[PDB]
Amino acid sequence: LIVTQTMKGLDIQKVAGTWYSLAMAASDISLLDAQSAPLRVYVEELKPTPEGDLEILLQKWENGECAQKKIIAEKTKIPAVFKIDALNENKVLVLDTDYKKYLLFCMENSAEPEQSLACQCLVRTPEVDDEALEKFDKALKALPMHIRLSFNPTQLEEQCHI
Ligand SMILES: [N]
Ligand SMILES: [Pt+2]
Ligand SMILES: [Pt+2]
């Protein structure tokens, strides 16, 4: 069992725009292990829709190349929980954000979180934000992460982080 506590009172409209994947953590090493790993994904943009769904623009390394993926995340009765069907995942969970600097979120397959859970620390600007990383560490304290990666500004500004 992995238990998640998402942000109460998330206004999805105020997350719109460019983000950078500053850090990642996964329950299973193999999810992130290599450059090719199935959940090694780099957020470019969050685009909320008026009716409160969420488009996720990400980059992923598959066919020798650093390729674009669009994920449609459909809203649920919980503003911080969205339904997806991509990367073999079916849930997006928004743990926390201050809207103007950082956003923490997880994807998982609800059918098996321990082989599935991947969480990221996003920032709006391509700079290491030590506040953001500490919030990510605290949000991860009660999650059973087995791989954790943090990127430097050089890796931030890059195609699939170099
Ligand atoms: N929050
Ligand atoms: Pt909040
Ligand atoms: Pt574990």
From Swiss-Prot:
Q: Which PROSITE patterns match?
A: LIPOCALIN
The top of its lineage is: Eukaryota, Metazoa, Chordata, Craniata, Vertebrata
Q: Name one GO cellular component term.
A: extracellular region
Q: Does the keyword Nucleus apply?
A: no
| Chief place of localization | secreted
List the transmembrane segments: none
How is this protein named in the record? Beta-lactoglobulin
On tissue specificity, the annotation reads: Synthesized in mammary gland and secreted in milk.
Q: Which domain of life is it from?
A: Eukaryota
Assembly and interaction partners = Under physiological conditions beta-lactoglobulin exists as an equilibrium mixture of monomeric and dimeric forms. Interaction with LMBR1L which mediates the endocytosis of LGB has been observed in PubMed:17991420, but not in PubMed:23964685.
Native organism: Bos taurus
Compartments in which it is found: Secreted
Which UniProt keyword terms apply here?
A: Allergen, Disulfide bond, Milk protein, Retinol-binding, Secreted, Signal, Transport
- Give the function comment from the record: Primary component of whey, it binds retinol and is probably involved in the transport of that molecule.
Instruction: Identify the InterPro entries for this entry.
Output: Blactoglobulin (IPR002447), Calycin (IPR012674), Lipocalin (IPR002345), Lipocalin_CS (IPR022272), Lipocln_cytosolic_FA-bd_dom (IPR000566)
The answer on whether this UniProt entry bears the keyword Transport reads: yes
What GO molecular function annotation could you give as one example from this UniProt entry?
identical protein binding
Which family, according to the similarity comment?
A: Belongs to the calycin superfamily. Lipocalin family.
Regarding how it is modified after translation, the entry says: Alternate disulfide bonds occur in equal amounts in all variants examined.
* Cysteine pairs bridged by disulfides in the record: C66-C160, C106-C119, C106-C121
